[PDB]
Amino acid sequence: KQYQMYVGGEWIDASNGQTEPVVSPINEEVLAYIQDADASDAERVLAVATTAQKEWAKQPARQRAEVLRKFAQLIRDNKQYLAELLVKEQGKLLKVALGEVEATSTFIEYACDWARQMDGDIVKSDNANEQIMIHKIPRGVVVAITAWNFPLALAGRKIGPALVAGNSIVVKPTSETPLATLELGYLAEQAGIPAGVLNIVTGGGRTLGNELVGHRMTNMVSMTGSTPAGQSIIRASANNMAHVQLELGGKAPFIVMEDADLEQAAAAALHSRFDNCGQVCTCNERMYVHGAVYDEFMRIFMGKVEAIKVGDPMDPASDMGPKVNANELAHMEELVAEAVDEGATVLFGGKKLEGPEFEKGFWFEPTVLTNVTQDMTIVHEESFGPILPVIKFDSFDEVIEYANDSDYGLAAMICTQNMHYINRLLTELESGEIYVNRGHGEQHQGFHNGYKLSGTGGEDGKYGFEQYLEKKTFYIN
Amino acid sequence: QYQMYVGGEWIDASNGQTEPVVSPINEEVLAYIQDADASDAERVLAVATTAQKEWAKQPARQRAEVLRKFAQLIRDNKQYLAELLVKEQGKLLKVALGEVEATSTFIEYACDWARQMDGDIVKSDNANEQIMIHKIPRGVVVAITAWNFPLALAGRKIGPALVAGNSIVVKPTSETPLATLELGYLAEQAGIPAGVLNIVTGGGRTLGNELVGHRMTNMVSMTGSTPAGQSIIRASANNMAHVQLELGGKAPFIVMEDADLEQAAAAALHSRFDNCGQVCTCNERMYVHGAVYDEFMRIFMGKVEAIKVGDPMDPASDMGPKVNANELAHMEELVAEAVDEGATVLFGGKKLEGPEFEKGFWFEPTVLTNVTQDMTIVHEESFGPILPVIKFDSFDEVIEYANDSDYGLAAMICTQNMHYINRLLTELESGEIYVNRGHGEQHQGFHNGYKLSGTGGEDGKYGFEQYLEKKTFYINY
Numbered sequence A: 001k002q003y004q005m006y007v008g009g010e011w012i013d014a015s016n017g018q019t020e021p022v023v024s025p026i027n028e029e030v031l032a033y034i035q036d037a038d039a040s041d042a043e044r045v046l047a048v049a050t051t052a053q054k055e056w057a058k059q060p061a062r063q064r065a066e067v068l069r070k071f072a073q074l075i076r077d078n079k080q081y082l083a084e085l086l087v088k089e090q091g092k093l094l095k096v097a098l099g100e101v102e103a104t105s106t107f108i109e110y111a112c113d114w115a116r117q118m119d120g121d122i123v124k125s126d127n128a129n130e131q132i133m134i135h136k137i138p139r140g141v142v143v144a145i146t147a148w149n150f151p152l153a154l155a156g157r158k159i160g161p162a163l164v165a166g167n168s169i170v171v172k173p174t175s176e177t178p179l180a181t182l183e184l185g186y187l188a189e190q191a192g193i194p195a196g197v198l199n200i201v202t203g204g205g206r207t208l209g210n211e212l213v214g215h216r217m218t219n220m221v222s223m224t225g226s227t228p229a230g231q232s233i234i235r236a237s238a239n240n241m242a243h244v245q246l247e248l249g250g251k252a253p254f255i256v257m258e259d260a261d262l263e264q265a266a267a268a269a270l271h272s273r274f275d276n277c278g279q280v281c282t283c284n285e286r287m288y289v290h291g292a293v294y295d296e297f298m299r300i301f302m303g304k305v306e307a308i309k310v311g312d313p314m315d316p317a318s319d320m321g322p323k324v325n326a327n328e329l330a331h332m333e334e335l336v337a338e339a340v341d342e343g344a345t346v347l348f349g350g351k352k353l354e355g356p357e358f359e360k361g362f363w364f365e366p367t368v369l370t371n372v373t374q375d376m377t378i379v380h381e382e383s384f385g386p387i388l389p390v391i392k393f394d395s396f397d398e399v400i401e402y403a404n405d406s407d408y409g410l411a412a413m414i415c416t417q418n419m420h421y422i423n424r425l426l427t428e429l430e431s432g433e434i435y436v437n438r439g440h441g442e443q444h445q446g447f448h449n450g451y452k453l454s455g456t457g458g459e460d461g462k463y464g465f466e467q468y469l470e471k472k473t474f475y476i477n
Numbered sequence B: 001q002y003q004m005y006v007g008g009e010w011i012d013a014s015n016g017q018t019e020p021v022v023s024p025i026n027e028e029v030l031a032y033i034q035d036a037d038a039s040d041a042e043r044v045l046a047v048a049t050t051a052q053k054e055w056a057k058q059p060a061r062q063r064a065e066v067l068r069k070f071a072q073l074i075r076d077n078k079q080y081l082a083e084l085l086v087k088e089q090g091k092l093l094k095v096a097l098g099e100v101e102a103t104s105t106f107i108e109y110a111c112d113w114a115r116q117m118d119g120d121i122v123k124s125d126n127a128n129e130q131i132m133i134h135k136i137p138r139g140v141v142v143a144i145t146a147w148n149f150p151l152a153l154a155g156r157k158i159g160p161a162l163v164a165g166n167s168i169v170v171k172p173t174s175e176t177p178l179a180t181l182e183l184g185y186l187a188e189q190a191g192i193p194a195g196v197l198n199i200v201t202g203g204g205r206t207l208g209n210e211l212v213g214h215r216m217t218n219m220v221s222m223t224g225s226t227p228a229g230q231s232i233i234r235a236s237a238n239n240m241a242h243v244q245l246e247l248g249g250k251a252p253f254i255v256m257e258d259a260d261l262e263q264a265a266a267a268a269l270h271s272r273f274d275n276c277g278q279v280c281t282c283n284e285r286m287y288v289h290g291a292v293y294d295e296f297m298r299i300f301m302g303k304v305e306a307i308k309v310g311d312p313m314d315p316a317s318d319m320g321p322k323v324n325a326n327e328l329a330h331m332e333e334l335v336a337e338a339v340d341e342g343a344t345v346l347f348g349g350k351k352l353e354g355p356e357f358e359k360g361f362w363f364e365p366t367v368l369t370n371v372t373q374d375m376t377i378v379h380e381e382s383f384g385p386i387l388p389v390i391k392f393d394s395f396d397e398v399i400e401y402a403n404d405s406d407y408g409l410a411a412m413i414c415t416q417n418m419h420y421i422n423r424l425l426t427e428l429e430s431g432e433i434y435v436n437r438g439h440g441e442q443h444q445g446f447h448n449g450y451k452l453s454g455t456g457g458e459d460g461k462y463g464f465e466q467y468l469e470k471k472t473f474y475i476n477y
């Protein structure tokens, strides 16, 4: 099977003859080939997107919302096909995959509610017989770049707001897991999305993606991915000063205070690390446990970790599937060996799975490291896998300083029944997305917003949607 | 000789370095300033970070009252600060009095947003859960200013930054810092706590570059040339500070066939030759419909020939000097290049001659005619009293001409045709549009540039809110 690219309502090949394979993490089966365009394909799809946007913007916002609501429902109609495709290309549990498809639909349906919230401002002038008008208008062409952990939902997360607001979009999905995203091309056509309003091109992030983000025709970049790629895009955007909405890496601490409910805290900590095989940007990446509850907490928590069943993600008994590819599995092995080198203990796991049920695929054991000090690399380098270091602490001010000792500042989780600890978080905890007495997991109406190198400018909600519009100011005498 | 205002104290550059400040009127050395390099960035950032922690705890009404007092002290010393602006920058005295006033009203206007910082209570999809989105200060703001209105640009940024609970590190232009440095004295007089307002002087490419990329810089608000802003965007990859950058312009001034010619001629005259062309919204290319060209030009050239160039303290002067020798040479180079490309020097085009102008940097009001759209003077920002004039035949043509540009800040159009004015909203790629009047924006507006004219905009509601960060809480009960 070989996919094409969706450009201007047609299916076309990369102008270089290049393809790229897509490999299942479950069994290393080559699932399909995709086009592997390079920088020379950017201008065509941007020009097509530019032309289509002029007509799309003229459509009443209510019609745009009606088309996208149909698009989102067509996605829901094909939930089972798309979920099984996500399981095969990306490796997530089937039940998580079904949840990702639903989130794709709801990300689009949530944005449709903003179809009627684009009013401008009538501003009173200091000068007589004069009016100041501040209109909201589309930016034009949005470039949307996605990551592989939730590729389909990350696309809907950006398609929805961009098209509702009257923009056209050029989606460059991750090259690791683009197949389900490419299938949206056919549903876009079924829903009646006009030709060129939704484009899907596949190719190298550092070639095609880099050409798209700095291009003259690109008015906005919405991108999800690692911090180094986001930094490259920031540099590129100096060439066009396109608005950049970049949602990048995390190193979320999970803090268990002395007065936490240990059973609630342990279950929240368990899911927050091992959801999606650790491949969540809000994951519990470093667990801080107060020394007074350490022993009792860890006995509860470790009983949970040791019962995680790693297996085939179509098997309903599986609690954790494979890692997405060999590069990411190698990263697990290197983080573990390096942590042993700097003095840490491997309490559980810490190796790739052995045995007949796992000779194909990229399988890593749920891993807990102890005797970890704050300065070890595993406390600072994002893991994005099932590796959890555990650090003791003795006071709030101590763990706060640990929490902020980071280049990342996306998620943070804390379990405590002390309301004054929680109130100090507003001014003292340098994370943009804070969970109190529960695990990670954001909502469409929230604001997914990362401090420091976790991004520059948030996503979702009203403050995410508002970034897909531009302003135009009129001084009218 | 001036020092730098850091942490409530006055100190020298840690290198031994100083830099002269020269009057454009007579080339008199006015003062020496500190010429600090990158090695002074950390220290001023450290005391700003410390001072912000206590500043943000003050009730917002108290911060507004301190800033209101700061704004009135600036007004109290209007005559001293205006004459200082005249000597260091060369603007006309009455414009200098206006700039001082706009410095105070920039701050006073920002004090009105002191009670417009409410967060959001957001209904959760889950029972017994609350989503809270708080608005908080960003932290340390770095403020970089340009030389054409140095004191107002400072106040345009000091006002919103400090009202919102940030601290500020102001790096003024090295060409014209003196009046800006005087603010340090007034900040002590007003009771601004030590370290909330800091003023450091040094090269933008050394000290400024180190300030904008530093880990302690949460936001950059900068005004200046497009190449400098492109350097700041690249540097911001290192910290992902929010960057509010207000860069170059190339504003078209458009005279449609149905324009009130006398009204259009006067608005065009001031829009180009205000502040010797040193305004980012200046009329930089004049498009005149061929059907009114001769009548409009006879009216317009009459007004140009009446411009009196001379001493900016003399109330008879309508235009003062260019700011320095390099900017003056740029005037001579742009004219010579335009002639070599085929333009006519209809008027002016030379350094002023004769005794009375043997000292200082004096250039004549200059009009270039028989210009084609592709000449360099139609594309490269001049920022001086040079005006090319281009014929056109249709609205569609002049929209293409207007948009054929790397800049997209200001635009001016004179017409009676409501259909033309309505088409501007979708077809004219400028963020700040003036209809049947000249340039000049207002504090309640939104000063916003498309393309390489800047990132997000400044002033008003949407400028103020960029000085705030968000924090999202998912609180489970």
Ligand SMILES: NC(=O)c1ccc[n+]([C@@H]2O[C@H](COP(=O)([O-])OP(=O)(O)OC[C@H]3O[C@@H](n4cnc5c(N)ncnc54)[C@H](OP(=O)(O)O)[C@@H]3O)[C@@H](O)[C@H]2O)c1
Pocket (backbone or CB within 6 Å): A145, A146, A147, A148, A149, A172, A173, A174, A175, A176, A203, A204, A205, A206, A207, A209, A210, A213, A224, A225, A226, A227, A229, A230, A232, A233, A247, A248, A249, A250, A280, A281, A382, A384, A410, A448, A450, A454, A455
């Ligand atoms: N903060 C959030 O909301 C959020 C949510 C999910 C994931 N993330 C983060 O994203 C990362 C996920 O893994 P990942 O490997 O997919 O991230 P990645 O390697 O940085 O890839 C992200 C995307 O950007 C492209 N890329 C790489 N360089 C680029 C460039 N110079 N210009 C344009 N695009 C470029 C990629 O293309 P190629 O695949 O072709 O290289 C890919 O489509 C993790 O760090 C995770 O924390 C963030």
Ligand SMILES: NC(=O)c1ccc[n+]([C@@H]2O[C@H](COP(=O)([O-])OP(=O)(O)OC[C@H]3O[C@@H](n4cnc5c(N)ncnc54)[C@H](OP(=O)(O)O)[C@@H]3O)[C@@H](O)[C@H]2O)c1
Pocket (backbone or CB within 6 Å): B144, B145, B146, B147, B148, B149, B171, B172, B173, B174, B175, B202, B203, B204, B205, B208, B209, B212, B223, B224, B225, B226, B228, B229, B231, B232, B246, B247, B248, B249, B279, B280, B381, B383, B409, B447, B449, B453, B454
């Ligand atoms: N859009 C607006 O609202 C607005 C309003 C007024 C002026 N402008 C523009 O400003 C330009 C003229 O002013 P200007 O000559 O002063 O601009 P400039 O030469 O770019 O200088 C701007 C400021 O930034 C600093 N600079 C230069 N490189 C820097 C860097 N790599 N990092 C940090 N700072 C750096 C400068 O420091 P040093 O000069 O001391 O070395 C200076 O303080 C014109 O193009 C005009 O259009 C824009």
